[PDB]
Design a protein around this nucleic acid. Structure first.
Ligand code: ADP
Ligand code: ALF
Length: 953
RNA sequence: UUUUUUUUUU
């Protein structure tokens, strides 16, 4: 107990590429380096999560005098020792890659082998395919930019050549726009009222200076309070200046937003301010939803990812790019900042404007070669802030007789009872009793307005919604309407936070950080902040993904406070101590220090931005060099990069897809094998954190009806596919029947819809790349068939390639073994999870992702056959003693070594087939006869019972 | 609240 967890956390996957530096020597080497260099820095530990789910973050930064650099590591672990070991490993690998320390020169339980026997006919088919394919048998550039030019659509990056915009010049378009604007300003009463409102905004007093700075400088930073008018006013200022200058058709403005909801809402706001419908002067572009404006004199409110996607076609005809909320420090935002700095360096005429309420303006200006910072004084309306001391003192709230602690630190101005209750309340726990007391006090305030409560995640949001709906006062929908605000609730529900509620009804919005910034809900008067931010951690050396609830930053608190006091005076209720608030950090750590970088590297290569190392070095905070090395090695070994680090056709195709490169490679292979529909639906399932099966209150495992969806296939992916098929059938008959079906069978309609949208988008992208429509014909799956099913079997075999190295072997009950026989458990939400002594037809499973919890869990399990594992879910196949064939250095199979060598010879054949498919996507269904024979023999190897010849199991 | 679901992709 807990030794299995320690060994699982200490597992190392990639010590080979980091100079042979691993967990069990990293700390010793780091201590040697510290003693030699007189480095006095010591580990600092951040307790993470509640008492029952406590984890740790370990931090350590070492300054290198030789490089004039501070090398930092930021790692997590189930306990202090594991977290510190991971942090030392990260920092030592960084020092190794930075050529500060030497490569490692020193030095440092087998499974029951599994019988695999093939039919003589199948062996002959394999041999003939080897003979046919002659397989050996083992015995910089910058983004294009241009000023506006006639007969060109900026947003589509293409010529117009249609309609009557052929002889229409930009000068005539400017004249028409100027005349229309003047006519509106002279006649439209609603437009005049909106200008009257806009002139009273705090940013309106500085419009002339803002426009002067924008005109005179290529890059300008704008800092103003939340709700001052940056987003809704700067683009309008620039466009109106151009239009009234007589150069209206020479303007095209990009305004990037961090959130889809924020982009859409602000675009709607600007459109209704201009008294015109979306698509005339204001447009937006988010995922699955785009309303494009006119090609000239327009504003497009997109997200950063949408802009990065548009970057491939160039930015011809773009005059101004406005980046919002540069404080978010997202990986896409940092990418965009690097691209934009290079672009303004190349093209002096392009204008880039950065605005944020909470930024280090000096840091950003130093990054942008000393650029103006324009400060917008004042606020629209004041916001009153209270802290935990104030809330307890004014609620007279004592914690119920239930079970550096900054809740013990308090000022002497507060009552002894208040400090007692504060010390008795726990920091890591969210008290629903305290929240209810605060809500009752707000009710007693007799002040109309919506309440916005910031909760870190789905579980807390819906637990609080259940608690409040079971309450007599807050369960009355005639008085209170509680609305979730999550990125994975249905989009109609996401909208409903903006719609007004009936008279006499108070709106309560329980939200994650989507409602944190950039949105204006017009009736928010009260903001309740729990001060917790949900973070997703990933440890590279053991492939563990962990969800952490950490303390939010002062930037996050100020942005959340800024949701109120925009249209009327507001209040902010911060549910943390004043001591805790002062203890908080200014900003959260950037995602660039904790996320994998292979997708970013693929985007770098797609946009022809040069070397990955140089590009990432030019960042605001350059990423860890060991992470850069891991990304490059991954892309090179998946062959998205040529031996000269150049993008291959496969690399280009995968760079254009919004999924992981391994999933994209899996989907290309599935297109070759005729199951692209299933491969796309399963890649969409593998790329979402939304849950397919809804678990009821107190449901620690799936229900019988939910489990029966997998039938006899023993696969979460098959269960998902069957659910998707039935949900499509019931959706074709109507939305109400769709909702009834999901609520009956225990599905999540939002998950079904997002999975379908992502799958459809992948299929359209494949069609655009040139793959034929015949290779993506939908195939129905009958999970109730107990036997073989060739299409589903090849699909599950391709899951092994698309989910590598996530192969686990069942031991008993929930216990499984991951790579190198590390203990793990089956996740509670899997169809394969059961309390009884379940026996599976095969013990080998492929799973989506590996989660670190109180125990290591495997999730999204799919039962696969030994031949499928050998062919696709492995990279190394070796001959061990007693003629036992070993795959991935830990899985033993009792198969003939000659047969194993023959089957392993097909892996380069599959690689060459993928290369051929990417070379000519249109002819993948009519290949040469060797490759057609390879496809057929791979199908015959991937049938479920291909390795069951003469074997009972 | 007995951690299944921070955010983002023409
Ligand atoms: N949908 C809306 N309904 C009512 N008022 C709004 C709306 N959107 C914006 N406003 C008002 O316009 C002002 C400007 O908002 P915005 O430009 O988004 O500010 P910033 O970009 O500085 O956060 C806000 O203070 C708000 O009062
Ligand atoms: F600068 Al903003 F909403 F775009 F505050």
């Amino acid at each position: 107990e807990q030794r299995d967890m320690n060994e699982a956390e200490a597992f190392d996957v990639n010590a080979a590429i980091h100079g042979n530096w691993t967990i069990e020597n990293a700390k010793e080497r780091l201590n040697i380096y510290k003693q030699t260099n007189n480095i006095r820095d010591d580990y600092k530990y951040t307790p993470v999560g509640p008492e029952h789910a406590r984890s740790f973050l370990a931090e350590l930064s070492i300054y290198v005098p030789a490089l004039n650099r501070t090398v930092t590591a930021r790692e997590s672990g189930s306990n202090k020792k594991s977290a510190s070991k991971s942090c030392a490993l990260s920092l030592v690998r960084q020092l190794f890659h930075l050529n500060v320390i030497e490569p490692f020169s020193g030095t440092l339980e087998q499974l029951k082998p599994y019988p695999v026997k093939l039919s003589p006919n199948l062996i002959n088919k394999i041999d003939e395919v080897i003979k046919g394919l002659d397989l050996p048998v083992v015995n910089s550039s910058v983004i294009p930019w241009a000023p506006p030019q006639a007969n060109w659509n900026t947003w589509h990056a293409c010529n117009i050549d249609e309609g009557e915009l052929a002889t229409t010049s930009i000068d005539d378009l400017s004249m028409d726009y100027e005349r229309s604007l003047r006519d509106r300003r002279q006649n439209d009463n609603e437009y005049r009222q909106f200008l009257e409102f806009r002139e009273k905004l705090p940013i309106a007093a500085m419009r002339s200076e803002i426009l002067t700075a924008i005109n005179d400088n290529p890059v300008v930073i704008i800092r103003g309070n939340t709700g001052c008018g940056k987003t809704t006013q700067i683009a309008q200022y620039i466009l109106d200046d151009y239009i009234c200058s007589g150069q209206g058709g020479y303007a095209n403005i990009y305004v990037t937003q961090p959130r889809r909801i924020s982009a859409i809402s602000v675009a709607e706001r600007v459109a209704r301010e201009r008294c015109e419908q979306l698509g005339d002067t204001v447009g937006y572009s988010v995922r699955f939803e785009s309303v494009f404006p006119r090609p000239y004199g327009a504003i497009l409110f997109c997200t950063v990812g949408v802009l990065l996607r548009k970057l491939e076609a160039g930015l011809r005809g773009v005059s101004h790019i406005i980046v919002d909320e540069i404080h978010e420090r997202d990986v896409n935002s940092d990418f965009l900042l690097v691209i934009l700095r290079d672009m303004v360096d190349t093209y002096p005429d392009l204008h880039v404007i950065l605005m944020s309420a909470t930024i280090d303006t000096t840091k950003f200006s130093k990054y942008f070669g000393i650029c103006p910072v324009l400060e917008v004084p004042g606020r629209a309306f004041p916001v009153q802030q209270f802290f935990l001391e104030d809330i307890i003192q004014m609620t007279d709230f004592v914690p119920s007789a239930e079970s550096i602690n900054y809740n013990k630190v308090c000022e002497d101005k507060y009552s002894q009872k208040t400090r007692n209750a504060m010390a008795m309340l726990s920091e890591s726990d969210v008290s629903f009793e305290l929240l209810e007391a605060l809500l009752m006090h707000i009710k007693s305030k007799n002040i109309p307005g919506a309440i916005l409560v910031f909760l870190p995640g789905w579980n807390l949001i819906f637990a609080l919604m259940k608690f409040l709906q079971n309450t007599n006062i807050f369960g009355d929908t005639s008085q209170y309407q509680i609305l979730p605000c999550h990125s994975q609730i249905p989009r109609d529900e996401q909208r409903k936070v903006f719609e007004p509620v009936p008279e006499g009804v108070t709106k309560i919005i329980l939200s994650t950080n989507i409602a944190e910034t950039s949105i204006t809900i017009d009736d928010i008067v009260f903001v309740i902040d729990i001060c917790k931010a949900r973070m997703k951690l990933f440890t590279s050396h053991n492939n563990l993904t962990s969800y952490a609830t950490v303390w939010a930053s002062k930037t996050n608190l100020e942005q959340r406070k800024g949701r109120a006091g925009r249209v009327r005076p507001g209040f902010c209720f911060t549910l943390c101590s004043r001591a805790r608030f002062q203890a908080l950090e200014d900003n959260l750590t950037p995602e660039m220090f904790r996320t994998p970088l292979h997708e970013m590297a693929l985007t770098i290569k797609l946009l022809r931005l040069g070397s990955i190392h140089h590009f990432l070095s030019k960042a605001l905070e350059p990423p860890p060099v060991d992470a850069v090395i891991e990304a490059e090695v991954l892309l090179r070994e998946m062959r998205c990069l040529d031996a000269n680090d150049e993008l291959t056709p496969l690399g280009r195709l995968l760079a254009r897809l919004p999924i992981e490169p391994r999933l994209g490679k899996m989907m290309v292979l599935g297109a070759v094998f005729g199951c692209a529909d299933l491969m796309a639906i399963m890649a969409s399932y593998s790329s979402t954190f939304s849950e397919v099966f809804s678990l009821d209150i107190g449901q620690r495992r799936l229900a019988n009806h939910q489990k029966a969806l997998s039938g006899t296939k023993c696969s979460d992916h098959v269960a998902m596919i069957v659910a998707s098929q039935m949900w499509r059938r019931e959706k074709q008959r109507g939305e109400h029947m769709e909702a009834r079906f999901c609520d009956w069978k225990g599905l999540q309609m939002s998950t079904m819809n997002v999975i379908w949208d992502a799958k459809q988008q992948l299929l359209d992208l494949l069609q655009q790349a040139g793959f034929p429509e015949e290779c993506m014909i939908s195939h129905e799956v009958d999970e109730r068939i107990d036997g073989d099913d060739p299409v589903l079997d090849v699909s599950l075999a391709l899951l092994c390639l698309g989910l590598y190295p996530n192969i686990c072997v069942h031991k008993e009950k929930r216990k499984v073994l991951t790579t190198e026989s590390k203990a793990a458990l089956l996740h509670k939400t899997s169809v394969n999870c059961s309390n009884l002594a379940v026996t599976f037809p095969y013990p080998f499973f492929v799973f989506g992702e590996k989660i670190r919890t109180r125990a290591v869990s495997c999730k999204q399990l799919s039962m696969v056959s030994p031949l499928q594992v050998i062919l696709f879910g492995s990279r190394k196949i070796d001959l061990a003693a007693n003629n036992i064939v070993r795959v991935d250095n830990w899985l033993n199979f009792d198969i003939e070594p000659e047969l194993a060598a023959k089957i392993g010879a097909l892996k380069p054949a599959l690689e060459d087939l993928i290369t051929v498919a990417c070379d000519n996507p249109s002819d993948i269904l009519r290949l040469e006869e060797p490759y057609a024979q390879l496809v057929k023999v791979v199908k015959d190897l991937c049938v479920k019972s291909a390795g069951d010849f003469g074997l009972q199991r």
